[model samples]
Target: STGSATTTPIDSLDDAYITPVQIGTPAQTLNLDFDTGSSDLWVFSSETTASEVDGQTIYTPSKSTTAKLLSGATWSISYGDGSSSSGDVYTDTVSVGGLTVTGQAVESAKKVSSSFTEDSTIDGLLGLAFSTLNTVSPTQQKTFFDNAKASLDSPVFTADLGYHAPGTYNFGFIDTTAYTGSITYTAVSTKQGFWEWTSTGYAVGSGTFKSTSIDGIADTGTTLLYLPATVVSAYWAQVSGAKSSSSVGGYVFPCSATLPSFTFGVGSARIVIPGDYIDFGPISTGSSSCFGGIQSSAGIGINIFGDVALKAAFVVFNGATTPTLGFASK
Candidate 1:
């Protein structure tokens, strides 16, 4: 069956977009981050230590007769940003939008890192990466999409992330009205359990396109766009007072700086990022320096096109054979 859900951006465009998901028999609704960077459906639950609960919502599996615990199964997962969660496993009816899947693996978190605990509004994370990346013990678990794909009219999901606005995530079918122009398709390498792809080249602002291969991951959970150090330097060079500040940990420039557009190439598609979006916002409240939305990946081998970049386009994550990523101007 086909379904679509609205995703609301929390706190400007600096954080992941959240979608409502239902779990258990009576359907306990939780606002979860739909993360495409990893694979695991984990939620803050009654099992979590009370001290860790803070103001977040918790899932109570015991209340749901449909919830069945997997006797010795457990899960532990961590993200690129160092945020982590670990928990026991349960099989239950999970639904998103109007689509439901029975016996979907739900990791009930008993432990969460400080980053997650502090984000009081985020109840959990619904991973959209390949099922192979699932962290459930004994046997890896399949993500919600993986389990529901066979029954869907088509094995696909579209992410229409927006800037400080609500967007839609459409499943089983593509909505032509959601995007403009033709969707440029690029083959993705799921070998790393991520929607990893190589861009043909890139350019800082309106500068000459540098013909260099850049491998990166399309991560919905991440907040900023990360590129190669040299590439980031090149982009900052165009701004009059842009500099790498040890205090801020990334490049920052005067708030009055006239930012330039950034562009990435995929086949014949030229995905351009607007200057205003790249400005991010002030480094801190009351500060005249603005932190760049795009920074250097540094030691991390893979660059990341997080919300900052994803919000600029309509992305199609096709689960059909020969997994591909389709990008279109929004």
Candidate 2:
């Protein structure tokens, strides 16, 4: 059987997308960020301190008779942005859309960082990365997708993220109608527990395609596309009023500036990002300054093809074997 769910972007931030998931016997529905960059099903729960919890809903294991504690087992995770969360582990029935996984590992958070605390709408994170990256101590845990794959008709999932619009995440099967034309597939290197792939080349605007290789990860949880500093500079150089703004922490330009398109290579296929999407949004409401959607990945440790890049195409995460990425314009 196959399953799918609708994903929605947060109103103001647009940083993360969320999907509702049902957990435990009584079925506590929680809005979780489906992050492919990490592996660990973590959530705010009764284990969390009152001060650490704010407007977000907490998962109470006691309310579910089927919740089983993994005694002495603990899990902790830290992100590149300095956000962190740590907690104990529990085994329960977790379901997403129409798929259900019994005895799934659900890490209940006991502590969280200010970044997560401030984002009240995201009650937890649903990690879709390889199970090898799970942070559970003593024994690593498997993700819902990993646990449910065997039961699925096919070992594949699709991410159809949209800008300021609703998207859909499909599991076990691909919705051919969701995309246009054929999907161009490229082999993936999952050595780092991520959907890492190498780009054959890139082009700024309609200029010549530079044969510069780029190593990056497809990270849905991240908001911006991060490339090399030199590449970022090269792209922004084409924009007349564009400049690196420390105050804005990225490349900023006049809101009225005409931007150029960007293209990147995947196998033999070229993916293009329109100029309009390049101008992320206004730095602030009523402000003339707009932030660049693509920024430097210098200090980020690794390049990331975040939401800004992924939304431009319909993506397929083929987990069957040798994990491959299938992309098609939506």
Candidate 3:
């Protein structure tokens, strides 16, 4: 049972993002989480005996109108969390936004972890973040994007994480009306296989902090914004009037009145995390206090702007060409 009831988006992500469609023989659609931090498309299946696919959705290829399993190929994906899933690798026809891409690699997952035994909100991961990071690389077949690129109405794919009931996630189309003015585009780095960004500084309110300005890296794979510990402490100090959360994880603070608007600087762009996030979910203790806008991540070198930071911007990813990053509105 992972974090559900809330969905976050990444602002100004590299155009490398792609939507996945695990089309079965009858064309059963199984939505997947496209992760950049790792390369794998995994799902719980009907054949999986690991625990009886409870909340997980199974995409049976036998139902698809054009499902063809790639024989003699097997796939297994293991996560750093110590959870793993395995399946038979198959190549089939997948369509996104009216663009039918054939021969795309997919994992007909037959085994899953106990951690994934809880809720079935998500069936699998799409791994749309990086092509180079793919577990079944150049050998399997073309990526969903590489195949659908020719059929896309435009070269852009938008992440509509906010459209569903506040916490639900959805993808597939790019909407261009969520911003105030023209959308700004950033260039991308070829190395690392991660979407890196340029930042001027981190700030709170109108005052800009002099701490070493760190660039932002939008990671769909990463669920939270991992900032320098000093920076996170300083930011929380300004907003919650506290040093930082005594506990662990995320920007948590005492649920108090007048929470300061903590903003992360992306070049000239100042992305702000609203106060509600500081009060996210049910408080563990009986204390009436909530969380702050920054967490304690001292030794962590990179400042990650996760879905909490992305959905606020309704980000658009543009990676139609190469060596460039594009930004647009929802």
Instruction: List the candidate 1 regions with Cα displacement exceeding 4 Å.
Output: none
- Candidate 3: TM-score? 0.78
**Model 3 ranges with Cα > 4 A deviation:** 1-22, 36-38, 50-52, 79-83, 137-141, 163-174, 209-213, 239-251, 283-293, 296-301, 328-330
- Candidates in descending TM-score order: 1, 2, 3
Model 2 clashing residue pairs (backbone):
none
Q: Residue 68's C-alpha lDDT in candidate 1?
A: 97
Model 2: per-residue Cα lDDT over 194-268, one tens digit each: 989888878999899988789999988888889999999999999998999988899998889989988888877
lDDT of model 2 at residue 116?
89
User: What shift in Å separates residue 83 of candidate 3 from its native position after superposition?
Assistant: 4.2
RMSD of 3: 6.0
lDDT of 2: 0.90
Measured by TM-score, the strongest candidate is 1
TM-score per candidate: 0.97, 0.96, 0.78
The per-candidate count of clashes, in order, stands at 0, 0, 29
Report lDDT (CA) for all predictions: 0.90, 0.90, 0.55
